mmCIF file of C-alpha atoms and ligand atoms in Angstrom:
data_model
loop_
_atom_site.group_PDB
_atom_site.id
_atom_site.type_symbol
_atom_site.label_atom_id
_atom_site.label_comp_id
_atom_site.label_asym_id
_atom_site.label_seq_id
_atom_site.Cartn_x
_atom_site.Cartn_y
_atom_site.Cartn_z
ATOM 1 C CA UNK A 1 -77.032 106.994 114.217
ATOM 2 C CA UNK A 2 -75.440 105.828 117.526
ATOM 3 C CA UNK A 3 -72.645 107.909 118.327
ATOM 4 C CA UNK A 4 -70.337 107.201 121.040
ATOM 5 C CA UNK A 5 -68.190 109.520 122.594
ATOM 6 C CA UNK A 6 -65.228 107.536 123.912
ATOM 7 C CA UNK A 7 -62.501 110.406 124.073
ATOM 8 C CA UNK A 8 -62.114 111.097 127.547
ATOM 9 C CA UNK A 9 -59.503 109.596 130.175
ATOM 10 C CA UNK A 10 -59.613 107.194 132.922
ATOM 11 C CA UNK A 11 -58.073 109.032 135.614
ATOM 12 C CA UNK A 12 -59.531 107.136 138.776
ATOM 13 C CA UNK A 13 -59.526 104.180 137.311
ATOM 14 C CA UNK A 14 -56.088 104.878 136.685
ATOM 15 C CA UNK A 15 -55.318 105.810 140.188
ATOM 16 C CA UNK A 16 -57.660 102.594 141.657
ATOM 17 C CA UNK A 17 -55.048 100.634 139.673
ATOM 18 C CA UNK A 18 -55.594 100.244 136.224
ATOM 19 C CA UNK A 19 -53.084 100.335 133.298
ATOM 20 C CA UNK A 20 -55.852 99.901 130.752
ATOM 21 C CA UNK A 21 -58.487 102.429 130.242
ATOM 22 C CA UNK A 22 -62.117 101.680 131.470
ATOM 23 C CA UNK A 23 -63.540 100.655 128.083
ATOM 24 C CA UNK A 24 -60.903 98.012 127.978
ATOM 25 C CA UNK A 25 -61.665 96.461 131.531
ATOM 26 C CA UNK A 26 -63.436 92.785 131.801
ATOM 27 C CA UNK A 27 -66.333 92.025 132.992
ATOM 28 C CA UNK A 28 -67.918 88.229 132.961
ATOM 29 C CA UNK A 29 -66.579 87.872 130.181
ATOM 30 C CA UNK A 30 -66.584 90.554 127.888
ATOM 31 C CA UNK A 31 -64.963 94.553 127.733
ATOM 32 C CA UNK A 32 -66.669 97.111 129.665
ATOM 33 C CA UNK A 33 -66.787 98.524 125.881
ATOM 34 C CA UNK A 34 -68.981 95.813 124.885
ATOM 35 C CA UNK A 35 -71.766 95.547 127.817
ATOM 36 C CA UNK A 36 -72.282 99.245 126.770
ATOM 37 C CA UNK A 37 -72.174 98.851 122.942
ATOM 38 C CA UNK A 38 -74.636 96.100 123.457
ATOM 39 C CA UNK A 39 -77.612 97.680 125.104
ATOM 40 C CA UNK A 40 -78.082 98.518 121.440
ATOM 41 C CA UNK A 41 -78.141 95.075 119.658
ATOM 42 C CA UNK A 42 -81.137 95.417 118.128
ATOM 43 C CA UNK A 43 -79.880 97.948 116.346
ATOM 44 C CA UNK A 44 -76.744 96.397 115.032
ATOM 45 C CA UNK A 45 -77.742 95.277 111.915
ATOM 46 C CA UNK A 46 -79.587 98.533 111.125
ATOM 47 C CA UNK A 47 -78.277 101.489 112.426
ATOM 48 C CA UNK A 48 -74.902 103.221 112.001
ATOM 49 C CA UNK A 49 -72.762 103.803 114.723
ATOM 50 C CA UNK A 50 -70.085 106.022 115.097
ATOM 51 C CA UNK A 51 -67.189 105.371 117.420
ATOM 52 C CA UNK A 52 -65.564 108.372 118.470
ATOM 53 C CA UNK A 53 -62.000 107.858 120.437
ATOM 54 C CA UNK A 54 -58.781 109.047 120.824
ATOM 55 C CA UNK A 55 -54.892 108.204 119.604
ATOM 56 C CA UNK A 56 -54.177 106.292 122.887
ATOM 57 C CA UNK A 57 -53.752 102.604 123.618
ATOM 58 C CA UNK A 58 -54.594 101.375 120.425
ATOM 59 C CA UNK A 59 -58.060 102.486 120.357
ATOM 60 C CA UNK A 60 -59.357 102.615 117.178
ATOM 61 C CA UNK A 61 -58.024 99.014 116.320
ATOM 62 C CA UNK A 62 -59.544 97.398 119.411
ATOM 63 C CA UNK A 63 -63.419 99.185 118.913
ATOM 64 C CA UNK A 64 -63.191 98.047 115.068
ATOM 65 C CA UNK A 65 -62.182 94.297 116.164
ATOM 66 C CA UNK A 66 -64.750 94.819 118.902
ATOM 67 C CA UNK A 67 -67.520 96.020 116.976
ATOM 68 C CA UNK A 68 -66.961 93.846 113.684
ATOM 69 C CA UNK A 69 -67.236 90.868 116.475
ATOM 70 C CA UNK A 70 -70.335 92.101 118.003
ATOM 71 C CA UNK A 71 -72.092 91.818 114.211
ATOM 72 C CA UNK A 72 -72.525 95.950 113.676
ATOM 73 C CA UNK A 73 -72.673 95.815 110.164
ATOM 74 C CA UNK A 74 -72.244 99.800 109.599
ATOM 75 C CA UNK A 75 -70.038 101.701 112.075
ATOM 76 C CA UNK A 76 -67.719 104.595 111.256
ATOM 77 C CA UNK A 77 -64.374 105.579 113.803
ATOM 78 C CA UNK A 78 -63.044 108.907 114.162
ATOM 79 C CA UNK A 79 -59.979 109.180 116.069
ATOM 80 C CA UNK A 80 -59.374 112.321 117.771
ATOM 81 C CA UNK A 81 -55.536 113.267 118.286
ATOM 82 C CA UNK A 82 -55.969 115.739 120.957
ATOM 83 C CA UNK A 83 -57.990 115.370 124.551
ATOM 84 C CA UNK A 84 -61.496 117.913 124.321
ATOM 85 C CA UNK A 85 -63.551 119.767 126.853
ATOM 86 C CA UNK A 86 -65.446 117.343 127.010
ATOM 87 C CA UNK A 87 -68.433 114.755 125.255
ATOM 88 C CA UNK A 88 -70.334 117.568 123.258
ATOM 89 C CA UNK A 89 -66.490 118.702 121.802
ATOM 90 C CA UNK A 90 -65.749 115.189 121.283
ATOM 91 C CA UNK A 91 -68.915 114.922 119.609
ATOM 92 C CA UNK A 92 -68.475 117.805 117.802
ATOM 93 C CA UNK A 93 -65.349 117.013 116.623
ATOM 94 C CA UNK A 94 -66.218 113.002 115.663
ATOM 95 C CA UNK A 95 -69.384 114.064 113.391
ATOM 96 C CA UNK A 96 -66.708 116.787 111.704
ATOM 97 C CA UNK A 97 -64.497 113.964 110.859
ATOM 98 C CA UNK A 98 -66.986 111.871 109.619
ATOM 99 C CA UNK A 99 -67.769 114.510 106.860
ATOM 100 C CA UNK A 100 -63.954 114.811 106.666
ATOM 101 C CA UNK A 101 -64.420 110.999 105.526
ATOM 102 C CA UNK A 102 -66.372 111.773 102.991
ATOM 103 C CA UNK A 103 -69.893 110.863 104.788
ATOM 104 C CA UNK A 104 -72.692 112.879 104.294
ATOM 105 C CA UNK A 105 -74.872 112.097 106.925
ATOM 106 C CA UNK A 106 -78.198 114.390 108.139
ATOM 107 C CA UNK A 107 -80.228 112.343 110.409
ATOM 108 C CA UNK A 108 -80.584 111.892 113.906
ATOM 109 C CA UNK A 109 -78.272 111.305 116.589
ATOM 110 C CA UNK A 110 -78.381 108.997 119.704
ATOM 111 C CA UNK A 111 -75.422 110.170 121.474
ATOM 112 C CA UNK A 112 -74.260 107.558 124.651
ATOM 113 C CA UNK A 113 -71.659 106.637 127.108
ATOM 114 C CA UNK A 114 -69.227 103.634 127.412
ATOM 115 C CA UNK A 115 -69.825 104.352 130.865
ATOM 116 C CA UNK A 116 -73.336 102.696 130.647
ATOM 117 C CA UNK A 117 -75.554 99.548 130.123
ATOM 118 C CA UNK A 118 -79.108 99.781 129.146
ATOM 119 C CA UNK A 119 -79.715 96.315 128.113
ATOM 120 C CA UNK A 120 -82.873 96.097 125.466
ATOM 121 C CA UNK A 121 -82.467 99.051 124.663
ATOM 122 C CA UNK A 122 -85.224 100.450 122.321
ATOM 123 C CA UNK A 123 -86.222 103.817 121.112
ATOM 124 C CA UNK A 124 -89.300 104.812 122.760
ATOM 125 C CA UNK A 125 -92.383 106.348 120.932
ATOM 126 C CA UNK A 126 -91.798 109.650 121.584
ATOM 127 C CA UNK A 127 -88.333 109.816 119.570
ATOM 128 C CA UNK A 128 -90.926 109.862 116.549
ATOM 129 C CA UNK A 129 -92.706 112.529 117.869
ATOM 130 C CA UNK A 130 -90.291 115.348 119.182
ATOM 131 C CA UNK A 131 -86.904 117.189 117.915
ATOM 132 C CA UNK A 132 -85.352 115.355 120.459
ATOM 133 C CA UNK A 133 -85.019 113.725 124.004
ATOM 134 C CA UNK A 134 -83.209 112.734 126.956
ATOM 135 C CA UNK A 135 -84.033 109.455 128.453
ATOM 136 C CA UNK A 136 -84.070 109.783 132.381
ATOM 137 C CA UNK A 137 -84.218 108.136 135.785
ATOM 138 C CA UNK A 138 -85.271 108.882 139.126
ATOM 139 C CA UNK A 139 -82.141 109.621 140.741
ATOM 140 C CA UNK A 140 -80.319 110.197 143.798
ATOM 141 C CA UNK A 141 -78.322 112.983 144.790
ATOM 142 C CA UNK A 142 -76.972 115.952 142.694
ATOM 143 C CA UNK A 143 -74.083 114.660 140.403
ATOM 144 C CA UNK A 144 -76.236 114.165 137.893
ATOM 145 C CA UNK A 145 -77.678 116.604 135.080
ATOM 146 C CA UNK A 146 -81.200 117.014 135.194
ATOM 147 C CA UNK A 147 -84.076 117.634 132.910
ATOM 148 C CA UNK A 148 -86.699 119.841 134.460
ATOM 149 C CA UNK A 149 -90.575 118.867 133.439
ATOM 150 C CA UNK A 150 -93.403 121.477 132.320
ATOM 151 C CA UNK A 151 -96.243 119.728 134.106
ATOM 152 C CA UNK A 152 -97.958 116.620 135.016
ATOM 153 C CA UNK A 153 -99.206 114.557 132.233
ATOM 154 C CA UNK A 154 -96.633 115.731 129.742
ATOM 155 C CA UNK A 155 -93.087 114.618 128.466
ATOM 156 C CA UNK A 156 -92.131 118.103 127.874
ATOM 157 C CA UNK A 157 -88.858 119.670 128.996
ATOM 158 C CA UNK A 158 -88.507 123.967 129.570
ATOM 159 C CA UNK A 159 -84.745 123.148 130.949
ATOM 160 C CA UNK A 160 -81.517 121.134 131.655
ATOM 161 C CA UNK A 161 -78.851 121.975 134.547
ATOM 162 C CA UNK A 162 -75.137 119.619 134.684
ATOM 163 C CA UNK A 163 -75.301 120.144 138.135
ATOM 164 C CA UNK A 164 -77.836 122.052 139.660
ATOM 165 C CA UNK A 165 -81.056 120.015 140.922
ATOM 166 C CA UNK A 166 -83.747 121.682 138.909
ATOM 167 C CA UNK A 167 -85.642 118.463 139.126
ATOM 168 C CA UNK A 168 -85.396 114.918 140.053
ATOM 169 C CA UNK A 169 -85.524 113.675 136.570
ATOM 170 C CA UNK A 170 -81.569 112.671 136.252
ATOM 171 C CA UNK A 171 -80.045 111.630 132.600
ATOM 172 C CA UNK A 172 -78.986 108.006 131.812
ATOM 173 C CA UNK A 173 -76.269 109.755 129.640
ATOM 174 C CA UNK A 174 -78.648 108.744 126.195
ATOM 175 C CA UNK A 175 -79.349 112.135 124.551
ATOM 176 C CA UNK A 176 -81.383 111.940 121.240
ATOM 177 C CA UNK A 177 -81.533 114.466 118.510
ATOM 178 C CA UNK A 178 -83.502 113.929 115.735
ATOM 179 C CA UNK A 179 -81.048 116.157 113.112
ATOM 180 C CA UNK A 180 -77.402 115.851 113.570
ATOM 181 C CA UNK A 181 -77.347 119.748 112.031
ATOM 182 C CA UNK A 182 -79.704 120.840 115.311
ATOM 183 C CA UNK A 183 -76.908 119.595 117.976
ATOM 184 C CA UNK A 184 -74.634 121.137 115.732
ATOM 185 C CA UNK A 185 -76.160 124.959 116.002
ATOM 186 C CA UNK A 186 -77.000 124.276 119.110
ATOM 187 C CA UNK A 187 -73.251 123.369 119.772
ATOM 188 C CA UNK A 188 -72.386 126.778 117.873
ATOM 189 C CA UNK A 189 -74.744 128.391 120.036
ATOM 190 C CA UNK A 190 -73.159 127.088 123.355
ATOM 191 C CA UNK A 191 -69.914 127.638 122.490
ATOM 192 C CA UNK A 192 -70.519 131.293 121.751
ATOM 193 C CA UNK A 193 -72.039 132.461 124.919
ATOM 194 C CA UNK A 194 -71.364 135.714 126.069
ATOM 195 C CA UNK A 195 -68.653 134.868 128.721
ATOM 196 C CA UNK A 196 -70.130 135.955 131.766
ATOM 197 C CA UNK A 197 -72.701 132.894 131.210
ATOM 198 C CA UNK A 198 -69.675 130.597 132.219
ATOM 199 C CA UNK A 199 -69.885 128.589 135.070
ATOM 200 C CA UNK A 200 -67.065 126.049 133.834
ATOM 201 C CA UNK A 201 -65.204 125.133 130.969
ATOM 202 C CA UNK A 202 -66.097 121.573 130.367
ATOM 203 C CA UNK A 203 -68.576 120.815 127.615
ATOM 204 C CA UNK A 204 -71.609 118.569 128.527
ATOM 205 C CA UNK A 205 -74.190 117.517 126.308
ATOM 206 C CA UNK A 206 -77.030 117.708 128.698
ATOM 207 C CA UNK A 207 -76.823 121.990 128.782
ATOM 208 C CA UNK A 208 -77.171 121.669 124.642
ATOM 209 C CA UNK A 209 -81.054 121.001 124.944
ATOM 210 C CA UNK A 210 -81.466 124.589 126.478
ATOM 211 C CA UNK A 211 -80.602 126.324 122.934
ATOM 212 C CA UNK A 212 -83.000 123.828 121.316
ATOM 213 C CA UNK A 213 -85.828 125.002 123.744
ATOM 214 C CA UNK A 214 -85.018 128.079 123.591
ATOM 215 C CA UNK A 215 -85.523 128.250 119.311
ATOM 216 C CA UNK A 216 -88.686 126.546 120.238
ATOM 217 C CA UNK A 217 -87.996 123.275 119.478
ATOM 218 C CA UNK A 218 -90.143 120.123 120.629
ATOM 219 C CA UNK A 219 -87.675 118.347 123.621
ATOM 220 C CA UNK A 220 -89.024 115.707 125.758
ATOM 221 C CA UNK A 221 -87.832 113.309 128.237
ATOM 222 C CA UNK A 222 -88.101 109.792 128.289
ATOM 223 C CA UNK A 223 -88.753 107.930 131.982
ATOM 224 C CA UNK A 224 -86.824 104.849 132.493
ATOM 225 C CA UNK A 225 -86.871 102.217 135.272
ATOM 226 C CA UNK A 226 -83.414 102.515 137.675
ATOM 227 C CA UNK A 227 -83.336 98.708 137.013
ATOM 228 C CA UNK A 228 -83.120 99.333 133.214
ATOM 229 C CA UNK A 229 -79.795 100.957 133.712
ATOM 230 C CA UNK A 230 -76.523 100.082 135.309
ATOM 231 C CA UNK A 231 -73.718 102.801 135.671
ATOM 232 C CA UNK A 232 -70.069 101.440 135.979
ATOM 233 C CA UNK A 233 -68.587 104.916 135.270
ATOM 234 C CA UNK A 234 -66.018 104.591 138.582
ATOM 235 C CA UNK A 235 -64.214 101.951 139.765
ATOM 236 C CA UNK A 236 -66.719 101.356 142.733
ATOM 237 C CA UNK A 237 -69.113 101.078 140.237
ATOM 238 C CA UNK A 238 -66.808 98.532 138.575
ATOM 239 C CA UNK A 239 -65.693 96.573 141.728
ATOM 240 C CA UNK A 240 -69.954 96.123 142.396
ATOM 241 C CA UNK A 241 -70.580 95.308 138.594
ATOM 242 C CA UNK A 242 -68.297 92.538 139.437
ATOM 243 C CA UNK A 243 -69.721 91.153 142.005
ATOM 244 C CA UNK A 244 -73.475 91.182 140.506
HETATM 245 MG MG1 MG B 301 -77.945 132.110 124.829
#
């Protein structure tokens, strides 16, 4: 399942200008919301998605007109009526209302960003090998979060930071778990940590993966090509997506 964490606000885009928020922008001609939904059409007639957003600008009508449009023949919305901490609360919080819908889904989860395009998108062969993975870059700087490598030769990953440059392996924002109820105790987990283990209060999925390899779980990392992946996550990144 494809989930979608869509919760968040559009602060600068707000302040570059904007009355709409990001997902709802235009881009040759189509929504920022559906250059990133698409990276995933070859999934569409397949796999589930779930859409999770919040009570604001009409939302949950415009991704169900959206996604109907695009051909997803199984998709699920949960509208969230108050802001989180953050993607891993918002996911959290979506696959809870899901049940609360009366689906009873176990499998895996593919969680991603409106805030990115991976066109041709496909899972790799590892996702059938591992409890779960996060597909990466070689990236610059240190706003990223990072997935730190065992050794040469193998996929393996002993750590992930939000902010701190363990590595030079930087996340695309696609975080795979093969059983929804893993990110769930792993989300338990988090969420109960002793509280002098707080650096911040914001919730990020990357950190999750540490609890998994922690209870010994198999996590990898999946290398991707920089040109495989376009960010348009601030409005510079918008303003240049416009121009390409
Ligand atoms: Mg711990």
């Amino acid at each position: 399942m494809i989930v979608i964490p869509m919760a968040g606000m559009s602060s600068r885009f707000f302040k570059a200008g904007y009355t709409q928020p990001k997902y709802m922008l235009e881009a040759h001609g189509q929504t920022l919301f559906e250059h990133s939904v698409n990276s995933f059409a070859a999934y569409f007639a397949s796999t589930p998605f779930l859409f999770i957003v919040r009570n604001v600008y009409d939302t949950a009508v415009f991704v169900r007109e959206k996604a109907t449009q695009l051909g997803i023949k199984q998709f699920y919305i949960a509208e969230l009526h108050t802001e989180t901490r953050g993607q891993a609360e918002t996911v959290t919080l979506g696959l809870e209302e899901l049940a609360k819908q009366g689906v009873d889904y176990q499998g895996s989860i593919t969680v991603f960003n409106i805030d990115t395009f991976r066109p041709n998108f496909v899972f790799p062969d590892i996702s059938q090998h591992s409890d779960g993975y996060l597909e990466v870059f070689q990236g610059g700087g240190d706003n990223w979060s990072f997935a730190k490598p065992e050794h040469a030769g193998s996929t393996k990953v002993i750590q992930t930071a939000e902010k701190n440059p363990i590595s030079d392996l930087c996340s695309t924002g696609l975080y795979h778990f093969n059983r929804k109820e893993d990110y769930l105790e792993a989300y338990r987990e988090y969420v109960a940590r002793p509280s002098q283990e707080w650096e911040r209060g914001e919730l990020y999925i990357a950190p999750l993966y540490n609890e998994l390899i922690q209870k010994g779980l198999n996590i990898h990392y999946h290398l991707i090509a920089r040109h495989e992946v376009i960010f348009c996550g601030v409005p510079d990144e918008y303003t240049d997506f416009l121009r390409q």
